[PDB]
Amino acid sequence: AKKPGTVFKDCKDCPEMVVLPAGSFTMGTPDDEVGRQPDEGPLHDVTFAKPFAISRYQVTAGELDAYLKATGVKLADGDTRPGRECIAGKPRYQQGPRQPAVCVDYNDVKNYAAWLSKKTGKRYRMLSEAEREYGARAGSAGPFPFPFDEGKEYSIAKHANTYGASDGYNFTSPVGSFPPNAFGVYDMHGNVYEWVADCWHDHYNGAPSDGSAWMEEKCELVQIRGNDWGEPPIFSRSGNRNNAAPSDRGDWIGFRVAREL
Numbered sequence: 278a279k280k281p282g283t284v285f286k287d288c289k290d291c292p293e294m295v296v297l298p299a300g301s302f303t304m305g306t307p308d309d310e311v312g313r314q315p316d317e318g319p320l321h322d323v324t325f326a327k328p329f330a331i332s333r334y335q336v337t338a339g340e341l342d343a344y345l346k347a348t349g350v351k352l353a354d355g356d357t358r359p360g361r362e363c364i365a366g367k368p369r370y371q372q373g374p375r376q377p378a379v380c381v382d383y384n385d386v387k388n389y390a391a392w393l394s395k396k397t398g399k400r401y402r403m404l405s406e407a408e409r410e411y412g413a414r415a416g417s418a419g420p421f422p423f424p425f426d427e428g429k430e431y432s433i434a435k436h437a438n439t440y441g442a443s444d445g446y447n448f449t450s451p452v453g454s455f456p457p458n459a460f461g462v463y464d465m466h467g468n469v470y471e472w473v474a475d476c477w478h479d480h481y482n483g484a485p486s487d488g489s490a491w492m493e494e495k496c497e498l499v500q501i502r503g504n505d506w507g508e509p510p511i512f513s514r515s516g517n518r519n520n521a522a523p524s525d526r527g528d529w530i531g532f533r534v535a536r537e538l
């Protein structure tokens with residue numbers, strides 16, 4: 278079996294995967310954490326019985342393009358909002374092949390993971406919300422697994438891409454433009470939000486404790502995680518939560534994939 282921290286790819290066009298360790302962690306946010314929102318409790322411990330892999334980066338534009346070429350799929354255009362349009366998977370801002378894939382809805386992510394699974398003979402899927410927070414924290418209990426930038430009160434521009442140019446980028450940055458966390462994972466605290474599988478809940482009362490996704494038979498809203506290029510760093514904290522309708526897409530939502538070992 279592959280040791281935690283091992284980085285591998287199942288094919289040339291496939292996302293770079295990193296093995297996360299089995300173990301437990303505390304999910305959610307302490308009451309007094311700066312910026313904490315009300316849906317980030319209760320704090321509750323979640324257990325991953327087995328190691329599993331996630332993409333160390335958000336899936337890239339070039340990686341998505343490889344899928345589009347292989348399958349012939351055309352992604353639907355997105356929501357009205359002048360200057361922020363998604364057209365067949367492409368945002369309006371300049372987007373090179375190592376910037377994150379965006380302008381995909383929830384089902385598009387599932388389709389990409391199904392294609393990857395068939396091509397590789399491995400089991401690819403969406404991350405669960407718990408897996409995503411686990412991977413973001415990499416053992417850390419506070420809002421960030423890295424220190425604040427020296428010289429300002431609450432700046433993370435040395436570690437993440439958030440609103441404005443102080444981090445080098447107005448829009449998204451190539452994946453891996455900042456240091457990784459202790460699990461070998463990049464961009465968990467900025468760049469783009471990410472789809473995860475879970476249906477939306479306004480709290481963690483009754484949340485699953487085994488690393489699974491918290492599903493409902495019918496869901497108008499699903500969870501998204503992380504924080505995007507246009508948002509302030511107060512929402513980059515590891516425990517920040519948000520949601521979208523699964524048919525939504527935007528130039529600010531991308532995704533990771535996970536792989537069973």
Ligand SMILES: [Ca+2]
Nearest residue numbers: 439440441446
């Ligand atoms: Ca920025």
